[PDB]
Design a protein around this motif. Structure first.
Motif, PDB file in Angstrom:
ATOM      1  N   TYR A   1       0.827  -1.196   0.000  1.00 29.52           N
ATOM      2  CA  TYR A   1       0.000   0.000   0.000  1.00 29.52           C
ATOM      3  C   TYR A   1       0.866   1.253   0.000  1.00 29.52           C
ATOM      4  O   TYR A   1       1.986   1.260   0.517  1.00 29.52           O
ATOM      5  CB  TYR A   1      -0.932   0.011   1.210  1.00 29.52           C
ATOM      6  CG  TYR A   1      -2.149  -0.856   1.038  1.00 29.52           C
ATOM      7  CD1 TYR A   1      -3.273  -0.382   0.379  1.00 29.52           C
ATOM      8  CD2 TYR A   1      -2.176  -2.148   1.536  1.00 29.52           C
ATOM      9  CE1 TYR A   1      -4.387  -1.172   0.220  1.00 29.52           C
ATOM     10  CE2 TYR A   1      -3.284  -2.944   1.382  1.00 29.52           C
ATOM     11  CZ  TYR A   1      -4.387  -2.452   0.723  1.00 29.52           C
ATOM     12  OH  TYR A   1      -5.493  -3.248   0.571  1.00 29.52           O
ATOM     13  N   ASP A   2       0.331   2.320  -0.595  1.00 27.37           N
ATOM     14  CA  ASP A   2       1.089   3.562  -0.702  1.00 27.37           C
ATOM     15  C   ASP A   2       1.215   4.261   0.646  1.00 27.37           C
ATOM     16  O   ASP A   2       2.287   4.778   0.982  1.00 27.37           O
ATOM     17  CB  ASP A   2       0.429   4.489  -1.722  1.00 27.37           C
ATOM     18  CG  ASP A   2       0.591   3.997  -3.146  1.00 27.37           C
ATOM     19  OD1 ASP A   2       1.617   3.350  -3.447  1.00 27.37           O
ATOM     20  OD2 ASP A   2      -0.313   4.246  -3.968  1.00 27.37           O
ATOM     21  N   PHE A   3       0.138   4.289   1.430  1.00 24.12           N
ATOM     22  CA  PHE A   3       0.107   5.037   2.677  1.00 24.12           C
ATOM     23  C   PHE A   3      -0.644   4.246   3.737  1.00 24.12           C
ATOM     24  O   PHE A   3      -1.454   3.369   3.434  1.00 24.12           O
ATOM     25  CB  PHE A   3      -0.574   6.406   2.496  1.00 24.12           C
ATOM     26  CG  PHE A   3       0.256   7.430   1.760  1.00 24.12           C
ATOM     27  CD1 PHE A   3       1.618   7.554   1.981  1.00 24.12           C
ATOM     28  CD2 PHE A   3      -0.341   8.280   0.845  1.00 24.12           C
ATOM     29  CE1 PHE A   3       2.363   8.498   1.305  1.00 24.12           C
ATOM     30  CE2 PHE A   3       0.400   9.224   0.166  1.00 24.12           C
ATOM     31  CZ  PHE A   3       1.752   9.333   0.397  1.00 24.12           C
TER      32      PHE A   3
ATOM     33  N   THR B   1       3.843   3.329   4.131  1.00 24.33           N
ATOM     34  CA  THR B   1       3.586   1.994   4.658  1.00 24.33           C
ATOM     35  C   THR B   1       4.853   1.245   5.037  1.00 24.33           C
ATOM     36  O   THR B   1       4.776   0.048   5.327  1.00 24.33           O
ATOM     37  CB  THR B   1       2.801   1.172   3.639  1.00 24.33           C
ATOM     38  OG1 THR B   1       3.530   1.108   2.406  1.00 24.33           O
ATOM     39  CG2 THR B   1       1.457   1.808   3.390  1.00 24.33           C
TER      40      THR B   1
END
Lengths: 245, 294, 196, 49, 49
Positions: free
Chosen positions: C93-95, C120
């Motif tokens: 995941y990006d964030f 992440t």
């Protein structure tokens, strides 16, 4: 104020601030005499060292520092990963990049200002015996001590001073370069910069003595078309109406 | 932005299908700048460099630094600062920061009061980059200027909590035995003396009262005495200068203290640090059993 | 269609999937920060950039905004800060997003704040009370959203329509509930805190 | 139902005396504050006092 | 006669300059392995009581 106590020596004596140049030492006890607060104490019951410091020839206070040895994850981590989450501030004037780069960080975070510590003041304004004691000295601090805005500074009287009058403080002067703040950017992270379906709109040209509004693009008035038709091939105007292909 | 098409209605410009031209610095160049940074700490000062307002011909001179810029700030000697460097384009747009390392200061402040003026030295970091390859690479990116950028430490990650003088405390004999109080803040501040000539001054006519009285600052020295040669030193009327030491074979602690229960002793073993941060920064007034070194 | 590492049938659903076993512990640091008196609870949720968003997979227990030696008056502000120690996050995941449910009374409408959108892969974050956008409390229920089985769609003005939909609700059969009840060996133990 | 006990170890006590009129003796000491029970938890023998 | 009502004393010690020790002669309370140089008790902030 801060209050602490030196730990007793391993022999059971008392650790004390050292006496400079072996002068004006503690009051040594007589033989076989114990302190009244510690009957089970060793002979002497006091330990004191000296510092060979000659530059000081007048009365003084031992200026000292609350050292901390171990600090894990100072700024959140040493990696680029932790550095990403940090907030940075400017420090120093901009210099030209010639044959070499020579930066000088002029603005830090520590001051060096006179501090008048009102150590003691009167319990009441009608008691018989009261004492006022102040110690004006220079010290390093992260708070702009010179923001003290009361006029009861450096006066011989110092009779009616109190926390209500002596050290009133204006915090605003202890301000950082918070307005313009920057941070690190990751090169390999993929943040998009292409908007095939997007139209920015500038401000109406004032045609007065100010800047050209067209050259100033802020992206504050964007408009995005549907992405399941295609990119914006062309924009055109016809009879007072914009048409987008 | 790199648009694709435009229109013009009602003196307003439209710009469609645009790319935000963002110019970054490659990781290898960032690492090269980090490696090529020769950072050092220097003892700089202000442009004036001479504070003639302050002299030793006056009772009190408040060193006021608000008439200058904010460059009066320095760096704590034992602190860790995370440093960096920026670059400016031809337009004035500042680039991102290039983290160069966490570097510790090595020079303290220094104020020296001369007869007619005072000189203050502010510690300042100094980054030097001389690798011509790196500088040419930076120039090729369109950069012209450069500036220092820092992350200052928070109170939790600070090496230094505060700085301040050390003041000896005092304790009454009867209370200390009772331990209701065992120590208390000295009503008078008690500095140490650099020499022992004051002892000879307190003898005969040598001591003139206009000089002022040195307080009882030695560790177990009672605050008081019976010698009239040092009568002006007496801080409490009901004190007899009873030493806080007794022979256990002769008298008990209670009996010994009863000879002068209202006698006080100095206590350099328990001190009271007085720093400006404690008074001004409300976060340091709530510390409870903090593990720190002195 | 520009990504070719699809390995499971759940990679296509509207709601995101969590593969790694995230272990996030939150502890209170005292001395720095600016928080209001009361109890605070942290909620976390992954979300891809321009993509899907997972439900609230982890919620920290209640943490008390009080002084190091006493409680706080109802009108007092405390200088506390909470360190969040992420461990084994879903790097795909990006964030990772952080929320903070703040209560100033008993059963009062809390003050949800959007603390930060951290990467992440980060391993530590200290949440001073300064930063954060005060989001509405009700949208902590809209994170991720429902799972529906629509029939048709349109697309007007960048808005999606979904008609003739079934709310796919997955329940546990009564026999399995009874089997779990019978197979539960419940016992009482004398545990303690991590410090001990 | 009584389930347990309490391990008393010390007691923090204090005293204050104020008199409207002065002491009888012109040179009398007056109120005298003695030591009573202000002891650490370690001296648990003299608990509940 | 001449009974005291209110007496007060003020003092402002002025330190015109601070002299700092060289690194070699710095005094540290803690020196590991040194029997005499024991450390400091946990710091406490006094406010009112």
């Amino acid at each position: 104020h801060l209050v602490f106590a030196f730990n007793y020596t391993e022999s059971g004596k008392q650790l004390i601030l050292p006496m400079k140049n072996n002068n004006n030492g503690y009051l040594a006890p007589s033989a076989n005499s114990k302190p009244f607060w510690n009957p089970t104490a060793p002979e002497g019951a006091v330990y004191q060292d000296s510092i060979n410091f000659t530059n000081e020839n007048r009365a003084f206070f031992w200026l000292a520092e609350l050292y901390r040895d171990s600090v894990v994850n100072r700024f959140g981590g040493d990696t680029e990963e932790a550095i990403l989450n940090n907030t940075w501030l400017p420090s120093g004037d901009s210099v030209i990049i010639g044959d070499s780069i020579n930066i000088e960080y002029t603005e830090g975070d520590t001051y060096y200002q006179r501090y008048d510590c009102l150590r003691t003041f009167a319990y009441t304004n009608e008691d018989q015996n009261s004492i006022v004691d102040i110690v004006s000295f220079m010290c390093e601090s992260k708070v702009n001590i010179d923001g003290r805005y009361d006029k009861n500074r450096g006066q011989v009287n110092n009779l009616a001073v109190s926390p209500t009058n002596f050290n009133l403080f204006n915090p605003v002067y202890s301000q950082k370069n918070n307005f313009f703040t920057f941070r690190t950017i990751d090169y390999e992270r993929f943040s998009i910069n292409y908007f095939p379906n997007s139209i920015t709109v500038t401000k109406e040209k004032s045609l007065g003595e100010d800047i050209d509004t067209w050259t100033n693009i802020t992206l504050a008035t964007t408009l995005d078309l549907d992405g399941d038709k295609g990119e914006i091939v062309s924009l055109n105007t016809y009879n007072n109406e914009i048409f987008c292909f | 932005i790199a648009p694709y098409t435009m229109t013009q209605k009602d003196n307003t410009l439209f710009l469609g299908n645009y790319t935000l031209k963002r110019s970054l610095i490659s990781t290898e160049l960032k690492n090269q700048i980090k490696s090529d940074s020769i950072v050092t700490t220097i003892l700089g000062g202000l442009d004036d460099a001479i504070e003639s307002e302050w002299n030793v011909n006056t009772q009190y001179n408040s060193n006021y630094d608000l008439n200058y810029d904010s460059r009066i700030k320095g760096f704590q000697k034992g602190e860790i600062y995370r440093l960096g460097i920026q670059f400016q384009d031809n337009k004035g747009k500042w680039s991102e920061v290039v983290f160069i390392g966490d570097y510790e200061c090595t020079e303290r402040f220094k104020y020296t009061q001369y007869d007619t003026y005072g000189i203050t030295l502010i510690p300042r970091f100094k980054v030097v980059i001389s690798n011509s390859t790196t500088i040419q690479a930076i120039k090729n990116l369109g950069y012209i200027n450069a500036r220092g950028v820092v992350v200052f430490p928070t109170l939790e990650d600070r090496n230094i909590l505060c700085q301040g003088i050390l003041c000896p405390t005092v304790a009454n004999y009867k209370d200390r035995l009772d331990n209701s109080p065992f120590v208390q803040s000295s009503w008078f501040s008690r500095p140490k003396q650099a020499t022992e000539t004051w002892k000879t001054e307190y003898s005969g006519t040598n001591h003139l009262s206009e000089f002022g009285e040195v307080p009882y600052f030695q560790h177990n020295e009672p605050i008081g005495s019976a010698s009239l040669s040092e009568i002006t030193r007496w801080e409490i009327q009901t004190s007899l200068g009873l030493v806080p030491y007794y022979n256990p074979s002769t008298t008990n602690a209670k009996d010994f203290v009863d000879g002068s229960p209202s006698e006080f002793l100095v206590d350099e073993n328990i001190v009271t640090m007085h720093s400006p941060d404690v008074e001004f920064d409300d976060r340091l007034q709530n510390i409870t059993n903090g593990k720190f070194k002195l | 269609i520009t990504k070719d590492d699809y390995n499971n049938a759940d990679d296509f659903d509207f709601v995101g999937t969590i593969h790694t076993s995230s272990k996030i512990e939150v502890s209170k640091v005292n001395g720095s920060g600016a928080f209001g008196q009361g109890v605070i609870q942290y909620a976390f949720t992954y979300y891809n950039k321009y993509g899907k968003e997972t439900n609230i997979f982890r919620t920290s227990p209640l943490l008390y905004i009080a002084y190091s030696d006493r409680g706080a008056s109802p009108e007092e502000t405390v200088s506390c800060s909470f360190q969040i120690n992420f461990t084994e996050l879903d790097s795909s995941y990006d964030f990772i997003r952080v929320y903070s449910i703040h209560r100033t009374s008993i059963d009062a409408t809390p003050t949800v704040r959007k603390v930060a959108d951290l990467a992440t892969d980060t391993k530590l974050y200290v949440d001073t009370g300064t930063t954060g956008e005060i989001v509405d409390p009700t949208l902590l229920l809209y994170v991720g959203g429902e799972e529906i089985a629509p029939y048709t769609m349109t697309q007007k003005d960048n808005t999606l329509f979904l008609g003739n939909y079934t709310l796919k609700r997955s329940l546990i059969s009564t026999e399995l509930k009874n089997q779990i009840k019978s197979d539960s060996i419940v016992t009482t133990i004398l545990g303690g805190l991590d410090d001990a | 139902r009584i389930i347990g006990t309490t391990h008393l170890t010390n007691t923090l006590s204090d005293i204050s005396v104020i008199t409207s009129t002065p002491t009888y003796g012109n040179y009398a000491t007056g109120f005298y504050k003695g030591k009573v029970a202000n002891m650490n938890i370690s001296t648990s023998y003299y608990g509940g006092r | 006669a001449a009974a005291l009502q209110r007496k007060i004393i003020s003092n402002l010690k002025f330190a015109s300059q601070n002299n700092y020790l060289p690194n070699q002669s710095v005094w540290e309370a803690e020196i590991s392995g040194d029997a005499n140089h024991t450390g400091i008790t946990p710091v406490n902030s006094w406010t009112e009581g």
